[PDB]
Design a protein around this ligand. Structure first.
Ligand SMILES: [Cl-]
Ligand SMILES: [Cl-]
Length: 162
C-alpha cells in the first residue's frame, strides 16, 4: 500500500463529472473542479485542467494525470506550511500518508486548523490524537473514510485498508 492506492480507495474513480459528498462538481479521483453550482462553470474548469474540449468526460489516463498532480500539490502544500511541516517531518511513512490524505480531502488550511490533534501527533500520543481527531465535522460527515484515516494515523499500519 501507498498514498496513491490509499486515496484511490477513498475517492474512487469516475470518468464523468459528478458531485462529491458536499455536492461540488468533481471528476476522476477526487479532483474538485469548482464549488460553484454551475455545471457549465465546472465544464469550463475541466477543459482548462485537461487542455481540450472534454464535454464533461475524460479518459482514465487523464484522470490519473490529474491525480498525480493533485497528490504532488498536496505534499508540497504540507512542506510549505509552517504549521504542517514540522508535524509531517516528525512522522513515520505510514502516518505521513494519513496526513496527506486529510490534506487532499480538506485542504491544507483545513488541516492546519486541527491544532490540538497536530500537537498530539507531533508528541506521538496516538490514542489521544485519534480521539481528538474524531471530534470534528470531518468525522461526523464522512465517518467511514475518517475512521480509516484515523486508524492509519493512530497505528502507523495499513490495517484499515486491508
Ligand atoms: Cl489543474
Ligand atoms: Cl465516509
Amino acid at each position: 500500500m501507498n498514498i496513491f492506492e490509499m486515496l484511490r480507495i477513498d475517492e474512487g474513480l469516475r470518468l464523468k463529472i459528478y458531485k462529491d459528498t458536499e455536492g461540488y462538481y468533481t471528476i476522476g479521483i477526487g479532483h474538485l473542479l469548482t464549488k460553484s453550482p454551475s455545471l457549465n462553470a465546472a465544464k469550463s474548469e475541466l477543459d482548462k485542467a485537461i487542455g481540450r474540449n472534454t464535454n464533461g468526460v475524460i479518459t482514465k489516463d487523464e484522470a490519473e494525470k490529474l491525480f498525480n498532480q493533485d497528490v504532488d500539490a498536496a505534499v508540497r502544500g504540507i512542506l510549505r506550511n509552517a504549521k504542517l511541516k514540522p508535524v509531517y517531518d516528525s512522522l513515520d511513512a505510514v502516518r505521513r500518508a494519513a496526513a496527506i490524505n486529510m490534506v487532499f480531502q480538506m485542504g491544507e488550511t483545513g488541516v492546519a486548523g486541527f491544532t490540538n490533534s497536530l500537537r498530539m501527533l507531533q508528541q506521538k500520543r496516538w490514542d489521544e490524537a485519534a480521539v481528538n481527531l474524531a471530534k470534528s465535522r470531518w468525522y461526523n460527515q464522512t465517518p467511514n473514510r475518517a475512521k480509516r484515516v484515523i486508524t492509519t494515523a493512530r497505528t502507523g499500519t495499513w490495517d484499515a485498508y486491508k
